[PDB]
Design an enzyme around this catalytic site. Structure first.
Site, mmCIF file in Angstrom:
data_model
loop_
_atom_site.group_PDB
_atom_site.id
_atom_site.type_symbol
_atom_site.label_atom_id
_atom_site.label_comp_id
_atom_site.label_asym_id
_atom_site.label_seq_id
_atom_site.Cartn_x
_atom_site.Cartn_y
_atom_site.Cartn_z
ATOM 1 N N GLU A 1 97.018 75.579 78.131
ATOM 2 C CA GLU A 1 95.752 76.135 78.591
ATOM 3 C C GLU A 1 95.932 77.401 79.414
ATOM 4 O OE1 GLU A 1 92.940 75.138 77.513
ATOM 5 O OE2 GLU A 1 93.744 73.405 76.431
ATOM 6 N N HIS B 1 88.330 66.812 76.954
ATOM 7 C CA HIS B 1 89.286 67.566 76.147
ATOM 8 C C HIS B 1 89.620 68.913 76.783
ATOM 9 C CE1 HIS B 1 91.582 67.731 72.464
ATOM 10 N NE2 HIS B 1 91.293 69.019 72.395
ATOM 11 N N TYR C 1 96.140 75.257 65.063
ATOM 12 C CA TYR C 1 97.234 74.500 65.665
ATOM 13 C C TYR C 1 98.463 74.416 64.756
ATOM 14 C CZ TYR C 1 93.160 73.299 68.473
ATOM 15 O OH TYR C 1 92.017 73.349 69.235
ATOM 16 N N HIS D 1 96.110 80.442 77.379
ATOM 17 C CA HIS D 1 94.807 80.971 76.956
ATOM 18 C C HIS D 1 94.265 81.910 78.039
ATOM 19 C CE1 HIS D 1 94.215 78.716 73.325
ATOM 20 N NE2 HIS D 1 94.182 77.536 73.918
ATOM 21 N N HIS E 1 87.951 67.476 67.487
ATOM 22 C CA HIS E 1 87.573 68.679 66.749
ATOM 23 C C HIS E 1 86.531 68.542 65.647
ATOM 24 C CE1 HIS E 1 91.313 69.200 68.832
ATOM 25 N NE2 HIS E 1 91.151 70.511 68.792
HETATM 26 C C1 MCO Z 1 94.097 71.456 73.741
HETATM 27 C C2 MCO Z 1 94.044 72.094 72.778
HETATM 28 C C3 MCO Z 1 92.866 73.074 72.694
HETATM 29 S S1 MCO Z 1 92.505 74.455 73.775
HETATM 30 C C4 MCO Z 1 93.747 71.058 71.438
HETATM 31 O O1 MCO Z 1 92.740 70.545 70.968
HETATM 32 N N1 MCO Z 1 94.958 70.882 70.887
HETATM 33 C C5 MCO Z 1 96.153 71.774 70.827
HETATM 34 C C6 MCO Z 1 97.427 70.937 70.708
HETATM 35 C C7 MCO Z 1 96.899 69.995 69.702
HETATM 36 C C8 MCO Z 1 95.456 69.834 70.205
HETATM 37 C C9 MCO Z 1 94.852 68.696 69.971
HETATM 38 O O2 MCO Z 1 94.351 67.921 69.049
HETATM 39 O O3 MCO Z 1 94.692 68.113 71.111
HETATM 40 ZN ZN ZN Z 2 94.362 75.624 73.035
#
Ligand code: MCO
Ligand code: ZN
Ligand code: NAG
Ligand code: NAG
Ligand code: CL
Ligand code: CL
EC number: 3.4.15.1
Length: 574
Positions: free
Chosen positions: A345, A314, A480, A348, A470
């Site tokens: 990313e 992830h 988000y 960030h 998550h």
């Molecule tokens: C990648 C990012 C996190 S830094 C994350 O978990 N995101 C943000 C866009 C939606 C999402 C997700 O579930 O993948």
């Molecule tokens: Zn992010």
């Protein structure tokens, strides 16, 4: 005791930099090489950092923040009084840290196999199946399998996790974990605010939903799609149906106005993950923003290791708290979707670099939503046909509506999903949802907000939420939802700052110095002031608003209403 306050903060900062940098080290090694050793070391470092936290958190609590003058000092000390998990008695802290590690490892190593012996991992195997297969049964296999293997395996850990995280929350002055998480926004009206924003985007989502449902009906058959009901959750091109851009081919508004195969193009001209991040780095610099340090390119994991190593794929950005070391860990694939994620990313990293000179206690975004939004903002411009064409990845109202549809499949479809995740978790945390009803409530919300239904009936033992990163990773999700709303607010403001006239969706802020300047001044504040100030700095006003997003998609909303109307669609799902 004002002078004592300053001293305390200075000391907290110096020491926290050292300990937090050390922790990031162990945490990174585990994330980029999941093993028994790296796990063991990570757990050991947890107790070390907790020790630090308790020591200073205890001192901080002896300060009557009310009596403190300096607001910047008052703010840091109030934050240090929150020990987080470190508030848990040693025995529970240890059990808690292990639960977290076990859930993370379980999710990261989960695989789905076939009778023969071919086992697929989530990235990129299952992800690719969900995005490219158009066979109801093959999609079902991947969808069900992932939940059977990952989801079900997380269930044994969740109840204890909820118990411990809530305890820690109560030990820090909150009623439960959700309360603690929501406090990150310093907004008492948060829940009502979010609800209003959600409602404002309903017309748009319901219309998109109805149009896509009709298209699926056309492709998968009337016997499998109810034009008046919810859409089966495995047909949207994404494992969680959180973004539907991968089924663009099944819903293209004007198929007579074809557009190049962006992904085929990228692969065609030898685009690589490194190339993808370089391009993002260029977009940030074009705005006058900061480029990533050389160290970034040397220590980041921009591709899925082939060492045989097991890792957390992830996407994530890392701040090693020394104002010099910043990295991205992502099992990047060569395609448009990941090109957007790479920018996400990189946003960030830009934030890390921007507030790197503030006390470490304030080295955070105005609020978690702001941190998630930065990269998406630039990616909005990157996604424009004109910009893609300049990258040689692409070659008329019809093309305009097709583009808006592509953007909507990602941004609009995500609104209800991003809203739903923590609605579920807040209710789990506050006790409303017991382990007896974990799954059943998950689907009631999935139905209520997204209008989706499970393709296969769920059974006792199922825990589909655990099949979403998550949840076991225990990373809050409302950030988000906030991000997707405010990023359009930022785009609108930045575009106006760049002098763009005409439709908002046609704006490309590339190379705009006025734009980079507003983002920069806002990011520099870090978490030193309530977020409305950063909002003001960027947009000229202080609130969150769905107007920008609505304005961006207005043309599509109008097209969708006319299209759905002539087809006699019944919006929603009775
Ligand atoms: C990648 C990012 C996190 S830094 C994350 O978990 N995101 C943000 C866009 C939606 C999402 C997700 O579930 O993948
Ligand atoms: Zn992010
Ligand atoms: C993976 O972690 C182990 C420790 O268990 C270490 O010995 C090995 O070198 C690491 N692999 C890489 C490629 O760094
Ligand atoms: C408050 O304390 C911080 C941290 O020591 C310092 O940077 C800031 O200038 C001080 N502000 C005032 C008004 O004294
Ligand atoms: Cl699900
Ligand atoms: Cl959050």
């Amino acid at each position: 005791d004002e002078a004592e306050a300053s001293k305390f903060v200075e000391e907290y900062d110096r020491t926290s930099q050292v300990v937090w940098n050390e922790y990031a080290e162990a945490n990174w090694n585990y994330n980029t090489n999941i093993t028994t050793e790296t796990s063991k070391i990570l757990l050991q470092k947890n107790m070390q950092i907790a020790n630090h936290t308790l020591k200073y958190g205890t001192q901080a609590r002896k300060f009557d923040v009310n009596q403190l003058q300096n607001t910047t000092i008052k703010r840091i000390i109030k934050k240090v009084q929150d020990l987080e998990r470190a508030a848990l008695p040693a025995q529970e802290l240890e059990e808690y840290n292990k639960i977290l590690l076990d859930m993370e490892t379980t999710y990261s190593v989960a695989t789905v196999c076939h009778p023969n012996g071919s086992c697929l991992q989530l990235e990129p195997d299952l992800t690719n199946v969900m995005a490219t297969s158009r066979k109801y049964e093959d999609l079902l296999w991947a969808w069900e399998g992932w939940r059977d293997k990952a989801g079900r395996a997380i269930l044994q850990f969740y109840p204890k996790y909820v118990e411990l995280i809530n305890q820690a929350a109560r030990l820090n002055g909150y009623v439960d974990a959700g309360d603690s998480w929501r406090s990150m926004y310093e907004t008492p009206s948060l829940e009502q605010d979010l609800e209003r924003l959600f409602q404002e985007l309903q017309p748009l989502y319901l219309n998109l939903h109805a149009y896509v449902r009709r298209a699926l009906h056309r492709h998968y058959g009337a016997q499998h799609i109810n034009l008046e009901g919810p859409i089966p959750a495995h047909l949207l091109g994404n494992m969680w149906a959180q973004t539907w851009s991968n089924i663009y081919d099944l819903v293209v508004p004007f198929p007579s106005a074809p557009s190049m195969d962006t992904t085929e193009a990228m692969l065609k001209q030898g685009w690589t993950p490194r190339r993808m991040f370089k391009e993002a780095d260029d977009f940030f610099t074009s705005l006058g923003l900061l480029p990533v340090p050389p160290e970034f390119w040397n220590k980041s994991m921009l591709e899925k290791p082939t060492d045989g190593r097991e890792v957390v794929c992830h996407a994530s950005a890392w701040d090693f708290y020394n104002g010099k070391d910043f990295r991205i860990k992502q099992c990047t694939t060569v395609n448009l979707e990941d090109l957007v994620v790479a920018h996400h990313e990189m946003g960030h990293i830009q934030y890390f670099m921007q507030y790197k000179d503030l006390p470490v206690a304030l080295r955070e975004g105005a609020n978690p939503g702001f941190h998630e939004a930065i990269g998406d903002v630039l990616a909005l411009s990157v996604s424009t046909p004109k910009h893609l064409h300049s990258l040689n990845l692409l070659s008329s109202d019809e093309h305009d509506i097709n583009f808006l549809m592509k953007m909507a499949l990602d941004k609009i479809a995500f609104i209800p999903f991003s809203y739903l995740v923590d609605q579920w978790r807040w209710r789990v945390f506050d006790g409303s949802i017991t382990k007896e009803n974990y799954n059943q409530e998950w689907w009631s919300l999935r139905l209520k907000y997204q209008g989706l239904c499970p393709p296969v009936p769920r059974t006792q033992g199922d825990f589909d939420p655990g099949a979403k990163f998550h949840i076991p990773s225990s990373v809050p999700y409302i950030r988000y939802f906030v991000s997707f709303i405010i990023q359009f607010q930022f785009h609108e403001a930045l575009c106006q700052a760049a002098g763009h006239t005409g439709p908002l969706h046609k704006c490309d802020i590339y190379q705009s110095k006025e734009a980079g300047q507003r983002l920069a001044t806002a990011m520099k504040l870090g978490f030193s002031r309530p977020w409305p100030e950063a909002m003001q700095l960027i947009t000229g006003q202080p609130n969150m608003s769905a107007s920008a997003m609505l304005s961006y998609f207005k043309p599509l909303l109008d097209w969708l209403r006319t299209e759905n109307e002539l087809h006699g669609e019944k919006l929603g799902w009775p």
